[PDB]
Write a protein that binds this ligand. Sequence first.
Ligand SMILES: CN1CCN(Cc2ccc(NCc3ccc(F)cc3F)cc2)CC1
Ligand SMILES: CN1CCN(Cc2ccc(NCc3ccc(F)cc3F)cc2)CC1
Lengths: 177, 57, 57, 250, 250, 278, 278
Amino acid sequence: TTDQMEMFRIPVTINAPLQQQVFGLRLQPGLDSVFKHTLLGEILNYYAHWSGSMKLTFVFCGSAMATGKFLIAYSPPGANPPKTRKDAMLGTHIIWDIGLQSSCVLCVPWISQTHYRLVQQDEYTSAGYVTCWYQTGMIVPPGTPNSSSIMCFASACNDFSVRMLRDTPFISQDNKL
Amino acid sequence: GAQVSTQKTGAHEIHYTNINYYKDAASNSANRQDFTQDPSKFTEPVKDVMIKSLPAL
Amino acid sequence: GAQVSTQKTGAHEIHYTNINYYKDAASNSANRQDFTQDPSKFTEPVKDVMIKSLPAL
Amino acid sequence: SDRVRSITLGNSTITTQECANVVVGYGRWPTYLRDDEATAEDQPTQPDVATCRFYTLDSIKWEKGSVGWWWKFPEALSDMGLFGQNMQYHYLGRAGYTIHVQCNASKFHQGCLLVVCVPEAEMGGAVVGQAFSATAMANGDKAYEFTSATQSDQTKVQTAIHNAGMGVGVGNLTIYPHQWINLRTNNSATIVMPYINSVPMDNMFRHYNFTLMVIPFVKLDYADTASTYVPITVTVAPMCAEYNGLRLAQ
Amino acid sequence: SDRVRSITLGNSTITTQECANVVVGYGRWPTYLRDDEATAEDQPTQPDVATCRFYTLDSIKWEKGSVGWWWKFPEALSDMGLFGQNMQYHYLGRAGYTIHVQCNASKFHQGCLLVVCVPEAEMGGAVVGQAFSATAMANGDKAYEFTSATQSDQTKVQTAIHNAGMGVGVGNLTIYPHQWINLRTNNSATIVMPYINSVPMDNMFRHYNFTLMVIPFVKLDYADTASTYVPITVTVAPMCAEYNGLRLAQ
Amino acid sequence: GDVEEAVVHVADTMRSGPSNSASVPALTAVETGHTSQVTPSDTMQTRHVKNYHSRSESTVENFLGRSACVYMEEYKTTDNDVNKKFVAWPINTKQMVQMRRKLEMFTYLRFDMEVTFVITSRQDPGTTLAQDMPVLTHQIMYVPPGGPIPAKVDDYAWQTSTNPSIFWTEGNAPARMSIPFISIGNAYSNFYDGWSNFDQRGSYGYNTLNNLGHIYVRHVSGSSPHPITSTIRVYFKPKHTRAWVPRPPRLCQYKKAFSVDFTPTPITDTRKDINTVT
Amino acid sequence: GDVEEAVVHVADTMRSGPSNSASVPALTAVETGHTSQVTPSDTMQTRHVKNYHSRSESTVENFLGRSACVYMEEYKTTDNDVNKKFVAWPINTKQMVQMRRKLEMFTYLRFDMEVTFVITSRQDPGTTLAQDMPVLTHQIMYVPPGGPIPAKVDDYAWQTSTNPSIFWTEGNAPARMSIPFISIGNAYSNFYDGWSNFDQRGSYGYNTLNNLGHIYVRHVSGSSPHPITSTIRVYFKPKHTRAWVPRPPRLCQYKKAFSVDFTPTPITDTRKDINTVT
Ligand SMILES: CN1CCN(Cc2ccc(NCc3ccc(F)cc3F)cc2)CC1
Ligand SMILES: CN1CCN(Cc2ccc(NCc3ccc(F)cc3F)cc2)CC1
């Protein structure tokens, strides 16, 4: 990313191969680089334990004439992450239709063997993966751009909570100011 | 003039006494027993209330 | 808000006062005055109760 | 507005922001088997949620020269999640279905599709008095192609479109439960099919309960656009499924 | 008479015409998870009957020189019917078990077995400060052999019988739920084990809930007979099993 | 009146079944600036769960209710340089990074303060160290703005008659005191986007509002035959806190004690590609 | 409400006389896994005895309610090696043998903790020892998992703003504090028969669940002309204890701090023959 602002836009194309992956990421809100510096991630990094559900909101910022469908799935922890849409569709997922309402919300349920999870997540307390796939593909009429972008928003549900206060590791100094 | 009150404890499965010795309220101990909260100020700052079930627009 | 209670003492041949000063239940002193117990969990885990006088089988 | 529909089965949800109403078989909603109508003695198994969920079969490509396609159920879902395992491990089965067929295109496209579920859609061979294997009419979730011209290969079913491979006028298929996908004013069709059969239960490997057909009555057309084809997707979801007669896996 | 017992789970039945009572864990019967104790949000799946049934693992041969065996659960049932499929397809699981161990011999045989379920039976390597793979301690339904002499291969767990591979006196295993199979007056042992763990639910591929051990305290003996060995069989049946967190098959 | 007497769990999860209707909780529109309020019960079947978790530890009172170092300095009991035998620290809360960050998550604050002092001493290295010295004593003096300032260890200003002071002796517990909300506004301000002069000139920034005074420390009368060095650490612990107008946490490293100056920083780290999850 | 008010002897022995009947309390069958419940009154004539003995001292609360050393370490006030001037101990309760054994008699535990620190200092031997140094001061800092870790004695991380810390001075009573049940489960687990990765690979054993954090200690500002060595001992004392699933006590000597590895051991000692009683 030569331009920093590019980090916030997920590319989308017309005439895409069928059933292609749009993006994928690990669900480590306090550790993964994706969620590390988000408004939610910053708060968790001041704590050691967390629990509750999460919300991922996606907004389509294409043209008004463009249309498409997307499949967003959450896969609980397992030996291997999904590789194809057929694998992803087995787990929790929602089919997103683009129309007048430009936003869709995927609620990640709290499925865990323990009441709490470590912010410094490891193999024992994994949380799973989130992936998005083409459901039908993006179609556009004549005289429109051939590419579009999507943005993602992260937030906590009303049952979220944290525990044990720790000092954050993102900020440091070597000499008195 | 002593105050009695409950102390944090578990859930499914307990009183402490406090007395103030100084004449300035700034000397009291931290009042960390308040748990009321309301997030609607930052999450729903809109003018017209929107029902989740109904369409946004 | 003080608690009064008996203290271990002998048999054939006696009260102490306690007050909690901190707002967290974890700060209280050990509650080593509980003596209830039930060993049937580990000694008689069978499904059908067996009378000692009657034959086992 | 009544143009928006939402369906939630199991752990899957379908949202269509531009659709017509839902058709419901012969006015009968799917339901479990009653005590006074059953015949098998042993207790059935009812793994709802695990089996009553949407399963998106693969997708087809709609070209200017497409003629139509068909799928046969429940064999189409033979290897789809726990539904397939339950069907394999049991002698008897029973379930209704909810069929949702998606197809979206811009305002400048034109075309019309017919979506219809044909119960007991028996088909005849390409060459009269010649048998065919159970591979020219159902091979899992893959779709089968109709043909504009008369078929000639003896190894395949008669694919003449205008006869629907059934010896009946294609225009008369309206009698069965159906819907139209007209690109002017529609994007998907929803059909709820109850369990229709002459017996309370039947084996799902030996009997094709019903057949799904998609036929373009008005061929696709467009001009001066970068989109060359219109993908079509089919999604199905068993409802009130119950199995019986456990045995070794087939 | 109280020497006859009959157990019916799902579509399977066990009848023993000579047995002692049934032991029930720590006096707790298996049960479903309560609303006020759960943590996961989504709806669980409860495929009773399909999964709550007896599954006879393979059999072992009891010789005059046998030392003992162990199995680890629930991994032992990893590929046994729909239980295995459900465990594969779900992130979280929870279930109690009913263990029945059969062993019959004539009136002229002598011997004694100890049957015990050890929760959290952590084991140490043969060579101190040396790791071992997840194959010297559980490989499906196959039983593992204890050893009379001290183990030496670094690729395996310490199999010294008198220490039980746990660094504790073998004679003190009586603390755990257990039963004795004494050929004089017994033919089978039945144990009902509730779900014991520090959390409401856990993954069944990563965590061994408990270990089953069979140890001959009095070695088998006989004289002048055509029977050379006494087969031993183990049967298990999950109870009140419920799964959660559906995802792709592992 | 010998006595007088005087909890909030998170929301539970309600059971939900299959649904098929025109209601679409999932679909929304973020353009309104309104965050959704959907719950997992609105998109998949869920069981009934009773949550006993509580958000007690995330209250602002508890979040800021921890003592933290804000300043440390060294001074010698005897030396040639007069300025090196005592400390003079203008009070501010922007010199130590962690506590600064913590505070800077809110625009305005209002709290009482609890101050604790930790003092330690050590003998400086040298050729001859054999000496006997009784226990040392230290004086801490607080000078509100505009008061006289000492210029040497034995200045007359050390005879505080109105300025509060603490005399402390080594070997005992650390000194402590409490201070009330001593501001001239209705709340303290971490940021101030404005100037000093009404002509939009002069100092710019929070420095403008920093007028809390000074702190001075010295050895009472200790004057050893050989140098002895002492260090003092100051800890602040807010009490009875109220906060307003939260702001995003800082991302770039601090570089000045009285300014917001920084250097551009990448948003976050990178990975192989958009699909990599290993 | 100025006040508020708020014992179990063992079973007695009942008199028994001669008996001759079909009841056979003595005969039983251990095959059922059921321990008998006979009493001496059921096999021989006995007098009436009132027992005033009580089992108060054998409660789990009292059994585990004793402070025990869990770790000790040494650090120097001044030295060439930076790593030798402070301690960094990952918290665990499996390094000292006695307390480990005591805990390992139960599979799961749930308790509050009381921590006490004992600190002592001594002057290192050398050719020249004549020096004068004031009383020393020490800092104990607790770093929950994922927090910043200091790399040297004078690192910025020692300015705790959220991490709890204790400043202590020699000559006073030992430091102390209390901690609540800080786990992520519904109970602590001494054993864990499982792996880390869902593929049955990776770390195996209780190590997997050990994520309690670290403890760091240093001299505040002491830097003597000659080295001074200090030692710290940490004591833990469970409170409000609950235990589940007892297991047999360990027999083989411990050999690793994060594993159950052992060497085979004889069941017990030997004697001349089965009849020897002398
Ligand atoms: C720019 N603002 C400066 C004040 N800061 C809060 C604050 C205010 C006063 C104090 N301490 C006041 C004080 C109190 C007692 C003393 F002896 C000396 C003092 F400086 C500490 C922090 C917020 C940012
Ligand atoms: C593997 N388990 C590790 C925990 N152990 C019990 C336990 C848990 C926590 C603690 N101490 C927690 C703690 C509390 C306060 C601190 F400052 C530092 C700490 F590490 C001590 C013993 C049981 C075995």
